[PDB]
């Protein structure tokens, strides 16, 4: 049954591929230190 | 970061208020310069009168 073995093995290898694809830890370490310098004071007239 | 951004906006508003102070000091300085030039021309007139005497 080499044809069914080939099809089941490749379907399982693709299933393992899409299991690993969603195996990640989303690290929300987006620091907001840029806003400490984004604000600019109003320029005067000289 | 959000609290620091709020305080920086407050500092910007205070900078705008001190800009108003700058413009008032500008017009005061212009009046000071004009009055000082009036004093010099008064001094020049008095010095010339003393020289004639």
Swiss-Prot record, chain A:
Query: Which cellular compartments is it found in?
Result: Mitochondrion membrane
Stated membrane topology is:
Single-pass membrane protein
Q: Where are the transmembrane segments?
A: 3-23
Query: Some GO term, biological process aspect, for this entry: which one?
Result: proton transmembrane transport
Coarsely, its chief localization is mitochondrion
Q: What function does this protein fulfil?
A: Mitochondrial membrane ATP synthase (F(1)F(0) ATP synthase or Complex V) produces ATP from ADP in the presence of a proton gradient across the membrane which is generated by electron transport complexes of the respiratory chain. F-type ATPases consist of two structural domains, F(1) - containing the extramembraneous catalytic core and F(0) - containing the membrane proton channel, linked together by a central stalk and a peripheral stalk. During catalysis, ATP synthesis in the catalytic domain of F(1) is coupled via a rotary mechanism of the central stalk subunits to proton translocation.
Q: How is the subunit organization of this protein annotated in UniProt?
A: F-type ATPases have 2 components, CF(1) - the catalytic core - and CF(0) - the membrane proton channel.
Q: Which family does it belong to?
A: Belongs to the ATPase protein 8 family.
Q: What is this protein called?
A: ATP synthase protein 8
Q: Give the originating organism.
A: Artemia franciscana (Brine shrimp)
């Amino acid at each position: 049954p080499w044809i069914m073995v080939f099809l089941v093995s490749m379907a399982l290898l693709w299933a393992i591929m899409t299991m690993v694809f969603f195996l990640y830890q989303p690290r929300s370490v987006s620091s907001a230190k840029g806003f400490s310098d984004r604000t600019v004071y109003l320029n005067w007239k000289w | 970061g959000f609290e620091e951004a709020i305080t920086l906006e407050e500092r910007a508003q205070k900078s705008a208020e001190a800009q108003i102070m700058l413009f008032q000091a500008k017009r005061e300085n212009v009046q000071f310069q004009l009055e000082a030039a009036y004093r010099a021309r008064l001094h020049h007139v008095n010095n010339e009168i003393k020289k004639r005497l």
